[PDB]
Scaffold this active site. Sequence first.
Site, mmCIF file in Angstrom:
data_model
loop_
_atom_site.group_PDB
_atom_site.id
_atom_site.type_symbol
_atom_site.label_atom_id
_atom_site.label_comp_id
_atom_site.label_asym_id
_atom_site.label_seq_id
_atom_site.Cartn_x
_atom_site.Cartn_y
_atom_site.Cartn_z
ATOM 1 N N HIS H 44 35.218 38.574 34.022
ATOM 2 C CA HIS H 44 35.572 38.531 35.418
ATOM 3 C C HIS H 44 34.280 38.710 36.209
ATOM 4 O O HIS H 44 33.653 39.764 36.160
ATOM 5 C CB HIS H 44 36.588 39.635 35.730
ATOM 6 C CG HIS H 44 36.973 39.711 37.173
ATOM 7 N ND1 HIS H 44 37.958 40.559 37.636
ATOM 8 C CD2 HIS H 44 36.478 39.077 38.264
ATOM 9 C CE1 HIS H 44 38.049 40.447 38.948
ATOM 10 N NE2 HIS H 44 37.160 39.555 39.353
ATOM 11 N N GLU H 71 37.292 34.821 34.934
ATOM 12 C CA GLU H 71 38.240 35.409 35.866
ATOM 13 C C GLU H 71 37.484 35.512 37.190
ATOM 14 O O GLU H 71 36.382 36.046 37.230
ATOM 15 C CB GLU H 71 38.663 36.783 35.382
ATOM 16 C CG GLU H 71 40.139 37.043 35.544
ATOM 17 C CD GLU H 71 40.579 38.294 34.824
ATOM 18 O OE1 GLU H 71 40.153 39.397 35.227
ATOM 19 O OE2 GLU H 71 41.344 38.173 33.844
ATOM 20 N N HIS H 185 47.299 41.761 30.947
ATOM 21 C CA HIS H 185 46.728 42.809 31.802
ATOM 22 C C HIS H 185 47.462 44.147 31.632
ATOM 23 O O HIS H 185 48.673 44.205 31.822
ATOM 24 C CB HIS H 185 46.778 42.345 33.251
ATOM 25 C CG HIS H 185 45.406 42.512 33.914
ATOM 26 N ND1 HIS H 185 44.442 41.530 33.856
ATOM 27 C CD2 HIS H 185 44.858 43.548 34.596
ATOM 28 C CE1 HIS H 185 43.350 41.959 34.470
ATOM 29 N NE2 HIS H 185 43.577 43.181 34.926
#
Lengths: 235, 235, 235, 235, 235, 235, 235, 235
Positions: H44, H71, H185
Amino acid sequence: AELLLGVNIDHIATLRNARGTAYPDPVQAAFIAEQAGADGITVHLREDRRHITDRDVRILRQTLDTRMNLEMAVTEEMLAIAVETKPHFCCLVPEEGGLDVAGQRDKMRDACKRLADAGIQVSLFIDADEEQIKAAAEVGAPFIEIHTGCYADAKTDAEQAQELARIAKAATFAASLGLKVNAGHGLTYHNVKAIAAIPEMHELNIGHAIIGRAVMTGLKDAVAEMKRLMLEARG
Amino acid sequence: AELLLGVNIDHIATLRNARGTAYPDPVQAAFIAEQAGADGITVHLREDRRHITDRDVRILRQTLDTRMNLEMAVTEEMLAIAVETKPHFCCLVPEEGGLDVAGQRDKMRDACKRLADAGIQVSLFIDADEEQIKAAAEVGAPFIEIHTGCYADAKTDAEQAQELARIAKAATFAASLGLKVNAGHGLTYHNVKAIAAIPEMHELNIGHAIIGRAVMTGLKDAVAEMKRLMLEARG
Amino acid sequence: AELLLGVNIDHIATLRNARGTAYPDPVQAAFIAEQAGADGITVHLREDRRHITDRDVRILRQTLDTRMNLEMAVTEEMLAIAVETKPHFCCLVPEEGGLDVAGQRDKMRDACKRLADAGIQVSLFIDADEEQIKAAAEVGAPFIEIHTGCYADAKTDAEQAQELARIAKAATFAASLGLKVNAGHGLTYHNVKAIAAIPEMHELNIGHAIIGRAVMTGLKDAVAEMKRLMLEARG
Amino acid sequence: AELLLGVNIDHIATLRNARGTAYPDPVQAAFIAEQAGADGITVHLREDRRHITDRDVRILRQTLDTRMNLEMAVTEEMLAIAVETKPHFCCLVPEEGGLDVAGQRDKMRDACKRLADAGIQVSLFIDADEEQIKAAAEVGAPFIEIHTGCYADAKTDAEQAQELARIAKAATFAASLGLKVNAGHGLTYHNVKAIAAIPEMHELNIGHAIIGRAVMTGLKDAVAEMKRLMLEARG
Amino acid sequence: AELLLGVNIDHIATLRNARGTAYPDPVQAAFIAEQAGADGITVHLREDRRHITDRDVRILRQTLDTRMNLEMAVTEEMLAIAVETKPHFCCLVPEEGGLDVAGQRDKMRDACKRLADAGIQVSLFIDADEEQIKAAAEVGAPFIEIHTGCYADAKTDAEQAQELARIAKAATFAASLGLKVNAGHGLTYHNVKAIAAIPEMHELNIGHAIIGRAVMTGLKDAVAEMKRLMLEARG
Amino acid sequence: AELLLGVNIDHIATLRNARGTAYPDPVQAAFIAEQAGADGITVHLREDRRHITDRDVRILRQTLDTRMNLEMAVTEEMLAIAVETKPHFCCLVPEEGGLDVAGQRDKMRDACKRLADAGIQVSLFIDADEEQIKAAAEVGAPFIEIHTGCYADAKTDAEQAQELARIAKAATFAASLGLKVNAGHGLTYHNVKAIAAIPEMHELNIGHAIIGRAVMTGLKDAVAEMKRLMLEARG
Amino acid sequence: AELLLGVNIDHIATLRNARGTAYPDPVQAAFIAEQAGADGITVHLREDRRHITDRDVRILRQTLDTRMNLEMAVTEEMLAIAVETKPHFCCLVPEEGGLDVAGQRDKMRDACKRLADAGIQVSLFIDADEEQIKAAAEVGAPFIEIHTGCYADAKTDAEQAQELARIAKAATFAASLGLKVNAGHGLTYHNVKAIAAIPEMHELNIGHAIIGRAVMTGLKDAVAEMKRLMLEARG
Amino acid sequence: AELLLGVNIDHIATLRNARGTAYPDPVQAAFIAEQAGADGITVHLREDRRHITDRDVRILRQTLDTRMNLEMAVTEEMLAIAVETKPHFCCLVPEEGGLDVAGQRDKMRDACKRLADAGIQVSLFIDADEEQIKAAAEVGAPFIEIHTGCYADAKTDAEQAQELARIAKAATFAASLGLKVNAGHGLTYHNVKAIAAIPEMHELNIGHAIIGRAVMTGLKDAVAEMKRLMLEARG
């Protein structure tokens, strides 16, 4: 029967010959593999002895606890060697990179018969091609080994599913003709499952990816890991 | 200071290029080694990119936690690369197999100065020869690396003790001249101790034997095992 | 250099011939031991081929990375064999337990002579006996291996310290004659240190104890363990 | 449906009795095997007490955590010892290799009943022969153990799928007669699966292959590997 | 000479009797420790047979590969058992916590002499107190074992250095009277070294800390780690 | 759904209090098991604080990553503690061995309701007896835990199949009354599967066998191995 | 002479507090480190309680088996907490990076005495500066911890041998003033040895490098590696 | 094929940037995870470059053996970056917790379009919300990743089963729209199975839990563990 895993130890020699010493030794690698999940050992004797040597084949033939699959081109030399060596399996290959059996029905017929006469079970290395497969069935080979190369190099997730399907239809076709069917060559820890899942598959002969994992984690775990993935696929 | 162990990962690439894939990757091998007892990493950039590539050097230079020893021949190309790359160490080698410094005092003087100007600590790869050693001292290299090749190939237990003695006297001579002295090239798990015991030795750069042990036991243990032997010798 | 460890792998084969299969294979055990701390491999070729065979020796001779120590009786058969096998070491044993060199000076003198012409370095397995030691030195043998059996068998602490003193003393005396000296027979993980503490000892050749630890723990650890106790003793 | 593994530790004793020391001790081997997946431990008490001894059996009987399977010939001595010891199982064996139950209906009839009154579950070691199976049923033994030796020794693939067929038929036959059926004897890491997949199989008693793997990898992994192959075969 | 490690396996039995099962079995714990650094095994046969039992002692006496150190209180029962068992060592304990030899000079005198005639080396478990040491010397005990509990409980780093000193002076004092000295009770992974560095120390008998570590890490490493700390201390 | 494993760490504390030290610490045992297969941790807070103590419970309640199953007797003290502690589960035990719910319908009725208001799921530790099951249903307990002791002690293979059956019918019977059912007391590595295959089983709470294995192999593998056996059973 | 290792587990908390879950728990990290060679555990309680929390310190104080080294700034809050907790050590830190003792002789004078009356051994985190060392001695602190950050960050070999010199002089200086000296902060697997070889060094408190190695290899090997490097440096 | 595992390595870097050194290095973690069961690596790239950096992404893009899942937030910066980086996957997240596709159909539609032209396969991270799912399908995104955060956070068994049902239902609905669906997640070793049991799930992308297990146990095992729980769930 359980899917089989044949381990190709050619690259153990590659690493040896990059320095002339005696190590690493393919003889040791074979014991490790035969005890970590390998059901067979494969060596490719090349005419240029660049990497595996007559010695390796000679000792290996006395030290293997399972069986040898001698990979070789179809030349007078190699056939001579094979007949003397008496490997349990012999995989004929060229010098997509498959043997052109369909285009040489006589040479292959002569080779198969001859090797068969020495008690050697023969496997013709060919592309996922029904003509080539039909040809192989006809010339007398009890085995063929589908080149999984294009599938491994599948640039696109699409090209891959496409390549997988061709291999699968090819195998089912191979079995209807009474052929036992192998694969291998290019398979990796990330693409071995789809191939292992194909029911007609008898044995997967894998080399490079396993040796590449071995320098990191050691040969024992590399071989065990591959076999485990293979049996996960089937179950 | 503790004896140092530099690990040469060239052969990780040898095994990679025997198949064009991305594995095994020298970048991974370096992390493993730096954490298993290696104090430095060595790569030999050859003009024919046969085995290590510009990419490896490029990424490696960003991923190494210790320092790089770039092994290269003395050509305009390589010097150019080295100066741009800014390796911590640079080991100059030929294209018994040692650099002929004594016979090229100018070229080596030019190279040393130039690399030195880029902040690169230089090491001249040479035979256990006091003329060559004297020459190296004179042209300005802060380091030399004694070729341990003949010693490794010692056919007779006699030729070996003889070769060991020459290396040892050579090192003591090298230090009296103010040179720091390395070795490596050909050392194995069975002959590393006598060399590690030589007090003047600063770092041993070992490659092949470690990679050869790694395909069997994994890189981590291979590197740790070498380092342990080295520290046993010193104590 | 440091105290050497020779691992006798005869009992790997005794576990094999107890069933006539091919496993376990001494060839595999040798690779393992050599990579876990063994500096040499010992094989005893009996005339009845009870455990080790001519096959084992033949392959072993081509697969060992270190050096073979052939253990054999002094007979025309074995000598001819030793001569053609060209092992690096030949340890002569009987067909207290050691060879009778004193009483067979002629046989022994010629034996050594014959093996030395084939380049084989000879070692005479004898008791911690000054007479036999002196005799050994006189027949020209470069090595002697002191039988540590009684020391091992010692039933009481005193009888042990005594047998120990007798061994240390002998070692010292043999070295005073220019003889290089080994030992190891019967040594265990619990009694090896006192022996390894003896300064004149060049190499300990141990078998049974190591293989016996191996079935429980694995050859690799069994060998590394022994090697570590030995170096600890000299630290 | 839940295959049991019985590990025969006889060869641990052979390795010990090749030296006359307390090691390796079968008592230790049993603790390891019982905790690595073994469901029972087998020991063959022979007349010449060459390998396993009275002491072993005596301590084993008090150390085992699962249960003993005492292998013995049909004699007054052995039978006497069995009733004294009270092993959970007793597997009658000759001292095709199988036991002749047909040709001795009376001896066996008495043996079984005697052992039975002592609380011992008896198993007759027989060949995959309809005649003997019927005899065992008629004679009163709860168990039979089909000799797999011939299947292990089968030189060719076809000679093997054949021996496999005979065993599978014999097991289904045995089961229809109310007999519980075991096997093992000759099974290896490479042929065990086909035998394990046989639905009727209750317990496979294995020894040699496991101990032979153990000298390389250690008893625990050796036993754990075999158990894992077995469950995979039924999975 | 070599600092020895005696592992007290009492708490293995403690963990067993907490359920009246057969596991864990002290006989197993004993094999593990003897192969992981223990030079001896200690068992305390308490009169009420709380932890260790008669069978434990009886089997242990036949399975131990090194030697037994029987801890016990001084009563005709225990003596008889001891004389009967012929354990290599007997450490007389009370049932500060040390044995009161001064207050019972007569009894101990008979015990030592008594056990000594059976060929059992005796050791008196006493406090680091001169009266008791002189007492133990007078009585004829060849060994004493200094109680390290107060040292182990040393709350402050000063209260602790007080104990160390007190134990060290006591050990030197004991040696000066011809006594050999042990210690060990309550030693842990964090305090063992200071005690192991004491020159006069012959063997450290430790139990609890080891079993406590073993529940997490397993016996093998718990033992090996303790032996390792000890050798580090004396180096 | 998923068969859960609750590890009872009581015996870790048992091993601790046998010396009044801080090791081994249950808080540590709890981290290990939760990361090796345990879905919950069980601690029996005995009134006399023999094994586990108040601090254990208090810290554990803050360190557990899964959930606590507080075993306790039914007394105002324990209830108050429980209501205070808010453990996810509470398994009421007696202080055949099962809790007598029939004979105390009133008390239990208050306990369940009482604990249930604090938000604690309650389970009654009872024998495989219908009177007690109906009793536990009537009283309102959401769970029951069948005592597997008699099954675990099953001397003969018949006396054993009797217990299995008895537990299986009892579990189905319990489910038919809307109760969820657990088991676990006295289960070992060799008998757990038969119990785990029982469909109605929700969670197996095991302690002793695991701690007993852990002293040899270490907690991590002891737990992982037990969880593994269980999943095998239900597959 | 016997260097202690203090592991700072602060970063275990940072990884946890990046998600707000109970994991990873510093309490678990401490158990591992204490059993892998750590002699003490350090935690820095910061004002913003960003990483380590009150809960951690609270449970840590009850779970640690060795002793706590509470790192904190000099404030009434922190000082208040220290006296309440009673950590074995307290290392005063700012919240060159070192603490200014010279410029606050009074605050520090009081802090030390206060902590001292609470039984806390105080250490002042200072730079390798003669001024501050003298101040710490004059102020009454038993310990100082020399900031090694500058030595770790030294870009070049020369800038490093320089910082190493300053530290070594400062430690010898500190010692002559009756101060006990620690270090750590910034040490890695690659620079720790030079600092460990400093005779005067009492304990090295290390955190980041160890936790960073731990995410790859696991906390235990990470801690064990560091301790081993440290002892080798003094060996 | 089988359920895939994507390992998010962001927290390796959060442990790095907590000290500004170069370790631990995400590049190393990626190699490890890919070889231990990860089928993809997730990074990310925050706009503040808090943990992952442009450097990490650049190198990571050249070192990954499998495929990168970038991400990122939907902003001009990140899009341009994603476009030039050409990651195989791009997972759009917010700058209940998921992206608001329903309320930003225009932004999202173009985003997907733009990334798809660069060959990147897009996934929209959203809540188990039918409205958002339908919206996602309408903007042309080929993938959606269902936020499992609330399921993870669920404080009560009921609230969990509920959140579970909500997720399964959503997955089913999204698949009915031709959407391929991921999740992951917040998933942990203790709650991952129920999720992995959902048939429509294509790949689980997990981070924190794995890295948190890694500091204790090592990345390799942490990853293999998660992978094994996942495949177990589908078995």
